[PDB]
Write a protein that binds this ligand. Structure first.
Ligand code: HEO
Ligand SMILES: COC1=C(OC)C(=O)C(C/C=C(\C)CC/C=C(\C)CC/C=C(\C)CC/C=C(\C)CC/C=C(\C)CC/C=C(\C)CC/C=C(\C)CCC=C(C)C)=C(C)C1=O
Ligand SMILES: CCCCCCCCCCCCCCCCCC(=O)OC[C@H](COP(=O)(O)OCCN)OC(=O)CCCCCCCCCCCCCCCCC
Ligand SMILES: CCCCCCCCCCCCCCCCCC(=O)OC[C@H](COP(=O)(O)OCCN)OC(=O)CCCCCCCCCCCCCCCCC
Ligand SMILES: CCCCCCCCCCCCCCCCCC(=O)OC[C@H](COP(=O)(O)OCCN)OC(=O)CCCCCCCCCCCCCCCCC
Ligand SMILES: CCCCCCCCCCCCCCCCCC(=O)OC[C@H](COP(=O)(O)OCCN)OC(=O)CCCCCCCCCCCCCCCCC
Ligand SMILES: CCCCCCCCCCCCCCCCCC(=O)OC[C@H](COP(=O)(O)OCCN)OC(=O)CCCCCCCCCCCCCCCCC
Ligand code: HEM
Ligand SMILES: [Cu+2]
Lengths: 659, 184, 97, 259
């Protein structure tokens, strides 16, 4: 009640916000009403919400990412609608107070709560399966890491209804994000969404680093690992080494707005150029966190659907290690126009193009993976071919931006905007949709619809090109980013084509919903029985579909690369053991939800200066941490009668289907 | 099992060391950003820092003696050695609170002269880590007194051994860069 | 045994703290020699604490637990020296020339 | 093709267009074969194509992996010789070798407009500059507020404007005309209206008439109290002329953050 909450924070007399507030409240109450109508509250608890299983946690990461993809796109369709109206002389809807929180929210939601959970969710589902592990290294920490991301999506979504979001852009540059130019609660919503979600993904990077190094199957060395595991290993290194930079940089912004300190101010000895140095020292390794497991996704798919071994494994592995080291020395290219000398700008310009060399090694290794194979045009293979065409265009564009002399006329332009949507939609979003289609039978036991999955590709491909190749042309014409009102009429008819391409992307999102509906409606017909719906090469496809919740009755003995492909070639590939042993598994824990529930209370009270509620919210997290340490019922043993029931019902489906 | 959590906590301390290096880089940029106010030579009392350095050093060897007693079956000596490094760590915190209280009262707080912002954000962040390890040490002390030197308790002693010795490593970089370079 | 390593690393760290503190508090007739010896003894005392207290070793986690420390030293040196060199050139510029 | 970067009117913009064109041509020798092999190998090596060779166990070739490493290395090597020479040639705050007495214009970012000072002429303007064609222009850029970016896209490079700081930019116009300049860094609600006109006069006779026009205005900027009256927040400002300016006004804007 106390603090700055005053019921004038709720945006009444503002119809665009109030319709979307009522669409989420009534859309959320209808979701609550369906669970109590079907009686699934005791099923979502104890099987999904408290789950320490990496397969359950991996699915829920993607569910959060897909839902936030709907919100982050439905306000991107409002910027395309506004810029088409603002050009050719109409001051329509979306005033600059309304418009400037939209790109800040679109940048934050799509980076942190769409691309990050989809990449982490694909690593959560697949990486313990590919190395022969039964779970992640720290299973309670994996459940806690998911719910810290949920705290991030709660705080951004209540900024829609309770207050306002930031109006500074998605990285919240200084003094405009300072307390004397942004006195409202919008930057505080930006600060505590990134802080509380950012400590969750930091624990994710530690968890998968230890899992790949320590929880591997016997006989699997590092150079016998799957390439997706190699790409996930290097992506988690960048999480451990760069998300601490985001933690300090937002905390130094927090001390400026709350305690009146002088870090990035103009007046009392603060340096505002230090934040931009610090926010991009995290900022470029963040975009290599997104693109690295996508490189691992496409390497498994291109080997599977060419029916051929992956070309140049050692070159592909060392290109990934080259990327994870060169990602930390290139970050000055985001502020070439700040005023550093020719020596500084040329040094970081030269080494930015050096990181293009291991990216080109990866591209041509996938091309020669499909050079003499038998290519089956699956939906997931279509995203792979469309990735190579798209990522080569926007990747080449970024190397043009890496030249400081070229960047002096293209900085903060729509050329820049078209560059990074070219390598995110082309790279990350195509990779996330490819890995979603590829590992759907392993996650759920049935296959997605092939007809509606291809139509989703054809709308996401050149429908993107209608959306963003005009922004390449507009970046040459001189149109800058974040432009809202009274746009030049020469920029009209090029913003009109870009708005038409956003409609084609909307149909591909709609084709994904139809593909998911039809596949669930017809799951009994497209059932995956053997656990290997394609010709799979890695150890994930040796299990049943879905895996038996311990993933492996006996842990596999790895001797070579593509371990399941060697087992099928050697002829064994499905061997029922004479006896089974008990399996040590962790228990589901209600804590982690409780720690995150106190943290979103703590985060909300820090935004609205409710200091008694912030102390209660912070002490609730610490006490729940302390009282969890006294718990001794953390693990249990799976009986052999439970294992033999699950294994014998897998091996008769192997008997029925020929093998 | 035990070595997996110990290795995982070592990776967290490597990310925590990168966290402190951002504060060190922010301090080095902003060390000359005194807005007409005090500099390092007008603030830093080096006999006061020298006592704080030895208190963290005395608690570093005291945790080592607690780890030695854990490698035998002396539950009582682990608790008594853990009680002494709590007192030395609370002495380190109390002198940093006394140092910060004197600056805020005398108008040299973090809201003036943004060198002082970088001073309070590096020494204060280190003191928040020592306070966090002092709470963890008290929680571990009551768990050993209740459950003994169990396998879960022996892993937690070695996890906090990595954490407590890391804070004395960070402090070596603190009094060098902040205090000794500032008081020249 | 292990008591000897804790005691030798305690005796060394007492000497490696007193001498840099005594040189500032006396003056030592040279500013540049003080700064060199302070940073030298700071690096040495860090290495004493890694070996004697943290028990760092090349064979502790099958080669790891040391390469992770070497990697983060290089990341810190990239982040600190890189940001200082950037901010020195940004602050040498943006002046009333 | 006629869009202010492929058709630039300044020497810096003309040198930057050749830098964009040579870089884009150099990257096309590896990107076009990457796209053509993506569609070409997919068509030729279909599973339904029974005439193509199938080599499932082929995964290593020393001659192929040599080329995959060499050609990106050789292109980036040629893309790093320039990107070193052009970075030192197209750098702002490096004066243009022209020897025609450069005109210094002092630039202040406001909320949300552009304030220009002509200290040699004693003239201050809002959201409009003028200078002779084929004469160097020395820009001293600062901010009174949050960070902006001074950008005339048809004339060349951009530079950031920061409070308490003085960035420097050198530009020149080869043809007379009026070029729209913008703010290229987002600065708040009035950011869409931070647009100015840069007029390149045919000669210095027409430039001196514009200066004589601007000193017929009754408004002056003789003190900082008149500056903070102008620096009150406003959007979509018209062109305004000030006849008498404080002689060291640009240093006073910087010193209100550095002192
Ligand atoms: C995950 C997304 C992602 C990816 C993959 C990349 C990859 C690259 N980034 Fe784009 N970056 C990304 C996300 C961003 N970068 C940005 C801004 C940005 C800027 C700033 C320009 C400006 O400020 O105006 C530069 C210079 C680059 C450079 C690059 C380069 C050189 C690559 C390279 O890694 C691409 C390498 C790929 C290539 C080159 C194609 C494949 C190679 C082939 C086919 C053959 C080999 C060819 C050669 C070696 C030439 N990034 C911004 C702006 C944020 C903001 O402004 O708010 C974002 C989000
Ligand atoms: C500038 O202020 C505004 C925003 O930024 C805060 C917006 O994001 C938006 C939202 C833009 C859109 C049209 C989205 C509206 C509808 C959609 C698809 C959102 C669906 C999302 C959910 C049901 C999940 C939210 C649930 C919570 C955890 C609470 C508006 C309208 C806005 O005015
Ligand atoms: C992160 C970057 C920023 C740093 C500052 C804030 C965060 C501080 C806390 C970080 C803790 C990191 C510890 C990681 C250790 C991982 C390796 C390890 O030792 O694992 C131990 C254990 C793993 O648990 P598991 O094996 O699954 O089984 C649990 C049985 N009870 O691990 C655990 O279960 C214990 C650790 C999990 C509990 C931590 C959750 C509370 C964090 C609240 C932070 C509040 C800060 C608020 C302010 C934000 C900044 C302004
Ligand atoms: C993480 C742990 C954080 C726990 C601390 C949160 C609660 C702090 C106690 C506040 C006690 C108090 O009375 O402070 C009030 C003081 C001034 O507030 P008041 O004058 O009442 O008016 C409200 C807004 N100006 O308010 C203040 O001056 C600000 C008090 C909060 C400071 C924010 C702390 C920073 C946390 C992130 C670190 C980075
Ligand atoms: C590679 C990893 C894969 C990607 C990760 C997942 C991302 C997408 C999430 C959707 C997938 C979850 C649903 C699929 C599970 C299989 C469905 C199922 O088992 O059926 C249960 C239920 C009805 O079946 P019942 O009779 O209860 O039990 C019989 C079981 N043979 O069937 C039902 O009708 C209920 C199914 C539950 C669906 C709830 C999930 C919400 C997902 C929201 C995403 C966005 C939706 C957009 C709008 C939809 C509404 C119009
Ligand atoms: C605090 C306010 C704000 C709140 C924010 C939201 C919190 C975060 C929510 C994230 C968690 C999402 C819930 C995950 C449930 C997914 C269930 C599912 O997909 O499986 C249903 C199940 C499938 O059958 P089976 O094959 O046995 O499943 C195992 C497959 N490996 O099928 C069955 O047999 C049983 C069918 C019952 C399942 C119905 C549950 C509906 C899904 C819940 C809502 C999901 C969509 C909305 C998510 C919003 C996220 C922001
Ligand atoms: C702004 C300040 C915010 C501060 C937030 C966090 C600090 C508050 C106090 C936390 C300390 C008490 C935590 C609980 C103590 C007992 C936990 C325990 O048993 O530790 C051992 C644990 C090994 O785990 P295990 O043995 O499996 O048992 C799991 C426990 N759930 O080992 C572990 O891995 C768990 C213990 C790890 C503790 C991590 C250290 C926290 C460092 C916090 C940084 C503080 C300042 C940061 C400022 C923001 C960034 C600038
Ligand atoms: C799928 C279709 C998408 C469309 C049509 C779209 C559209 C837009 C538009 C119109 C802008 C503002 C351009 C400007 O400022 O002039 C923008 C900015 C941005 N977009 Fe997207 N976007 C899409 C997807 C994504 C995705 C998937 C990401 C994932 C990371 C993303 C990240 C960003 C970021 C970071 C910004 C800059 C935020 C800011 O300016 O503050 N976008 N997008
Ligand atoms: Cu970058």
């Amino acid at each position: 009640m106390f603090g700055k909450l005053s019921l004038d924070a709720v945006p009444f007399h503002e119809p665009i916000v109030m319709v979307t507030i009522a669409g989420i409240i009534l859309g959320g109450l209808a979701l609550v009403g369906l669970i109590t109508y079907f009686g699934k509250w005791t099923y979502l608890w104890k099987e999904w919400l408290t789950s320490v299983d990496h397969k359950r946690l991996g699915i829920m990461y993607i569910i959060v990412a897909i839902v936030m993809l709907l919100r982050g796109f439905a306000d991107a369709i409002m910027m395309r609608s506004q810029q088409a109206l603002a050009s050719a002389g109409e001051a329509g809807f979306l005033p600059p107070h309304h418009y400037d929180q939209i790109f800040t929210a679109h940048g934050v939601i799509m980076i942190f709560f769409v691309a990050m959970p989809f990449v982490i969710g694909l690593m959560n589902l697949v990486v313990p399966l590919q190395i022969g592990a039964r779970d992640v290294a720290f299973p309670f920490l994996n459940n806690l890491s998911f719910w810290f991301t949920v705290v991030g999506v709660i705080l951004v979504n209540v900024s829609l209804g309770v207050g306002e979001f930031a109006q500074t852009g998605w990285l919240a540059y200084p003094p405009l994000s300072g307390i004397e130019y942004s006195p409202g609660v919008g930057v505080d919503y930006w600060i505590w969404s990134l802080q509380l979600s950012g400590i969750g993904t930091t624990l994710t990077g530690i968890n998968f680093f230890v899992t790949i190094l320590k929880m591997r199957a016997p006989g699997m060395t590092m150079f016998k690992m799957p390439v997706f595991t190699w790409a996930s290993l290097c992506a988690n290194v960048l999480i451990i080494a760069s998300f601490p930079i985001l933690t300090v940089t937002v905390a130094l912004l927090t001390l400026d707005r709350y305690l009146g300190t002088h870090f990035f101010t103009n007046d009392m000895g603060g340096n505002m150029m230090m934040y931009i140095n610090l926010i991009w020292a995290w900022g470029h390794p963040e975009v290599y966190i997104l693109i690295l497991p996508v490189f691992g996704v496409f390497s498994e798919i291109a080997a599977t659907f060419s029916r051929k071994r992956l070309f140049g494994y050692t070159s592909l592995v060392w290109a990934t290690v080259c990327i994870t080291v060169l990602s930390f020395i290139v970050w000055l290219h985001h502020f070439f126009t700040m005023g550093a000398g020719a020596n500084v700008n040329a040094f970081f310009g030269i080494t930015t193009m050096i990181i293009a060399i291991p990216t080109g090694v990866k591209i041509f290794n996938w091309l020669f993976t499909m050079y003499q194979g038998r290519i089956v045009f699956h939906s997931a293979m279509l995203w792979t071919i469309g990735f190579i065409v798209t990522f080569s265009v926007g990747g080449m564009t970024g190397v043009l931006l890496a030249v400081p002399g070229a960047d002096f006329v293209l900085h903060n332009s729509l050329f820049l905007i078209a560059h990074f949507h070219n390598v995110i939609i082309g790279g990350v979003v195509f990779g996330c949709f490819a890995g979603m289609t590829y590992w759907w039978p392993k996650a759920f036991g049935f296959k997605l619809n092939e007809t509606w999955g291809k139509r989703a590709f054809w709308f996401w491909i050149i429908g993107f090109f209608v959306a963003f190749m005009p922004l390449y042309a507009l970046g040459f014409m001189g149109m800058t980013r974040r432009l809202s009102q009274q746009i030049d009429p020469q920029f009209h008819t090029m913003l009109m084509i870009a708005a038409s391409g956003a409609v084609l992307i909307a149909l591909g999102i709609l084709c994904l919903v139809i593909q998911m509906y039809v596949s669930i409606r017809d799951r009994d017909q497209n059932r995956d029985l053997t656990g290997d719906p394609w010709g799979g090469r890695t150890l994930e496809w040796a299990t049943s579909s879905p895996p038996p919740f311990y993933n492996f009755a006996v842990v596999p003995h790895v001797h070579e690369r593509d371990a399941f492909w060697e087992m099928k070639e050697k002829g064994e590939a499905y061997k029922k053991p004479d006896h089974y042993e008990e399996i040590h598994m962790p228990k589901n824990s209600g804590a982690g939800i409780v720690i995150a529930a106190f943290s979103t209370i703590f985060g909300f009270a820090m935004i609205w200066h409710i200091w008694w509620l912030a102390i209660v919210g912070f002490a609730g997290m610490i006490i729940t941490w302390i009282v969890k340490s006294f718990d001794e019922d953390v693990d249990y043993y799976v009986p052999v009668a439970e294992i033999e029931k699950l294994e014998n019902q897998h091996f008769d489906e192997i008997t029925k289907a020929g093998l | 099992a035990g070595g997996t959590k110990i290795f995982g906590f070592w990776i967290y301390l490597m990310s925590d060391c990168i966290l402190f290096s951002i504060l060190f880089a922010t301090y080095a940029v902003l060390v000359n950003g005194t807005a007409g106010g005090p500099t390092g030579k007008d603030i830093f009392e080096l006999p006061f820092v020298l006592v704080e350095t030895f208190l963290l050093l005395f608690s570093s060897i005291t945790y080592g003696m607690a780890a030695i007693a854990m490698y035998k079956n002396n539950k009582s000596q682990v608790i008594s050695w853990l009680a002494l490094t709590w007192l030395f760590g609370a002495g380190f915190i109390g002198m940093e609170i006394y140092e910060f209280h004197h600056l805020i009262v005398n108008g040299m707080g973090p809201d003036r002269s943004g060198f002082l912002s970088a001073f309070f954000a590096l020494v204060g962040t280190h003191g928040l880590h020592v306070t966090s390890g002092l709470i963890w040490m008290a929680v571990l002390m009551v768990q050993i007194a209740r459950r003994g030197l169990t396998s879960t308790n022996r892993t937690r002693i070695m996890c906090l051994s990595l954490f407590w010795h890391f804070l004395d490593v960070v402090w070596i970089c603190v009094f060098t860069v902040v205090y000794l370079m500032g008081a020249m | 045994g292990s008591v000897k390593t804790y005691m030798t690393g305690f005796i060394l760290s007492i000497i490696l703290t007193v001498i840099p503190f005594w040189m500032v508090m006396t003056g030592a007739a040279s500013p540049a020699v003080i700064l060199g010896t302070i940073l030298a003894m700071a690096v040495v005392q860090v290495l004493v604490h890694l070996v004697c207290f943290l028990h760092m070793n090349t064979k502790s986690d099958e080669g790891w637990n040391m390469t992770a420390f070497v990697f983060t030293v290089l990341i810190i040196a990239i982040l600190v020296v890189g940001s200082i060199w950037i901010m020195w050139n940004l602050n040498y510029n943006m002046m009333m020339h | 093709c006629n869009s202010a970067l492929l058709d630039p009117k300044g020497q810096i913009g003309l040198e930057q267009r050749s830098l964009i064109l040579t870089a884009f041509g150099l990257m096309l020798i590896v990107v076009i074969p990457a796209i053509l092999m993506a569609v070409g190998f997919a068509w030729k090596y279909r599973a339904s194509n029974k005439d193509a060779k199938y080599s499932p166990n082929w995964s290593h070739s020393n001659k192929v992996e040599a080329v995959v490493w060499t050609v990106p290395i050789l292109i980036i090597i040629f893309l790093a010789v320039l990107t070193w020479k052009t970075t030192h040639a197209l750098e702002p705050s490096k004066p243009l070798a022209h020897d025609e007495k450069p005109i210094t214009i002092e630039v202040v970012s406001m909320d949300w407009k552009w304030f220009f000072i002509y200290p040699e002429q004693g003239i201050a303007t809002v959201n409009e500059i003028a200078f002779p064609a084929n004469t160097p222009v020395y820009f001293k850029v600062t901010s009174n507020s949050v960070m902006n970016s001074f950008f005339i896209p048809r004339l060349g490079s951009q530079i950031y404007a920061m409070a308490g700081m003085q960035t420097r930019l050198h530009l020149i116009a080869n043809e007379p005309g009026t070029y729209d300049g913008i703010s290229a860094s987002y600065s708040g609600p009035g950011f869409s209206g931070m647009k100015f006109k840069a007029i390149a006069t045919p000669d210095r006779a027409a430039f001196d008439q514009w200066v004589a026009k601007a000193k017929q205005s009754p408004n002056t900027m003789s003190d900082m109290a008149a500056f903070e009256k102008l620096a009150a927040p406003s959007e979509y400002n018209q062109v305004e002329y000030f006849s008498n300016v404080k002689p060291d006004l640009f240093a006073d804007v910087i010193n209100k953050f550095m002192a």
